[PDB]
Design a protein around this ligand. Structure first.
Ligand code: RBF
Ligand code: RBF
Lengths: 222, 222
């Protein structure tokens, strides 16, 4: 009764509200890293900078789409890249949704894109020619624009899936926590799910990098 | 063919290996926050500091157990708190395992534990009387022990589930990234799954805070 439990619960509620938990009008954005397109790239005769999914990637996307089949989704967005579109299509096909495209969801520009050799940088050294703040801002505006183009769901939480690219996604999530490259020291697995909570222009990182739909899969799928 | 794709792929493989992705002999720790015990706590007739799960928490634990039913698990550990034990019991029984207890997984000591009203701190201000460094040390010890206690499984990835408490868990994961309280600025949802990848004495934060198994449930389940 008056034994500290009231103070504990009220403060917990206040903490939850800072992270948009227990707050009306919150939408969720499920950020999805595209599935594998690099197995076999050494022998690929298509555009090697815009490859289709590999056989392994098709299998990952099928596991992802099954995982998300039961989740109410109200929109699916993708970058213009084949690997993102193809992943998004697998997801959207379980929901009666059409994949909407936003080129601003593209991966960070890489040395590879510029036709230069790639180099392995030390931890914490930003490795891309497109600056981190520019990547973060185009991801932030692409995400809030996808929410603004999604009508609020009539029952419960509006949820938008956004299929993008692992480096640009982890840059977005770090920037949302006011962290620079290397501080949020993670790589997002292919087909991983990361959740943001969004209300008006405010965006909160709720979960990061979960590819647990692959946990029981054979090793040639991981 | 030798158009920059080979250096791109070689760098990519090296980056994956730094984060234990696609590396043989890696184990996983699934860090699980216990299920709800706070709904209705204001009227709870037992010990409010060590309560059983609520009706809502039992529903969350059921959804969590169903999520993990198809995931191979080779050990289940929990703190001694009833709410952690009850959350773990739902997971363990479906994998043919007894729940094992390690009190080093207990929640950070709170103002409530010390007889002071809970106080809402500004973001970034550490709110507990047990120092962060001490919480991180005992959590790392406990997880290291849970990994060491689990014999390698002969199929796929060896996996240990560890059911604990959200503040201690996010302290551990921040510490594993050499970050202090408030930098990894997240609260972990109840029944959320976070994953560490482990090989030798190296622990990598793989994923954080996923409670997507709750997304299809009724709204009174979160
Ligand atoms: C933490 C991390 C470190 C990275 N390091 C490099 C690197 O040093 N050089 C490079 O060309 N790409 C790097 N990348 C990109 C990466 O190797 C690969 O191209 C993409 O992650 C695959 O989608 C890195 C990405 C992340 C997330
Ligand atoms: C990011 C974060 C900030 C929190 N801030 C406080 C706080 O200011 N005061 C407090 O009593 N508990 C705080 N907590 C604990 C929280 O309110 C609650 O007691 C636990 O999360 C319940 O398991 C915090 C927890 C997190 C992870």
């Amino acid at each position: 009764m008056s034994d500290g439990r009231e103070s504990f619960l009220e403060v917990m509620r206040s903490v939850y509200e800072r992270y948009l938990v227990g707050v009306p009008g919150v939408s969720e954005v499920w950020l999805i890293a595209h599935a594998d397109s690099y197995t076999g790239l050494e022998d690929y005769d298509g555009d090697p900078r815009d490859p289709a999914l590999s056989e392994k990637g098709r299998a990952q996307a099928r596991l992802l789409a099954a995982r998300l089949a039961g989740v109410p989704l109200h929109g699916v967005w993708a970058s213009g890249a084949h690997r993102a579109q193809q992943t998004a299509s697998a997801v959207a096909a379980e929901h009666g949704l059409r994949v909407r495209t936003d080129a601003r969801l593209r991966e960070v520009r890489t040395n590879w894109d510029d036709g230069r050799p790639s180099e392995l940088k030390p931890h914490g050294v930003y490795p891309f020619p497109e600056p981190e703040k520019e990547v973060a801002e185009r991801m932030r505006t692409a995400v809030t624009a996808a929410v603004a183009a999604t009508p609020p769901a009539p029952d419960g939480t509006t949820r938008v899936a956004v299929v993008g690219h692992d480096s640009a996604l982890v840059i977005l999530m770090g920037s949302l926590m006011n962290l620079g490259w290397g501080q949020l020291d993670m790589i997002l697995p292919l087909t991983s799910v990361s959740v943001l909570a969004v209300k008006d222009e405010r965006m909160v990182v709720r979960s990061i990098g979960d590819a647990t739909h692959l946990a029981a899969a054979p090793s040639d799928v991981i």
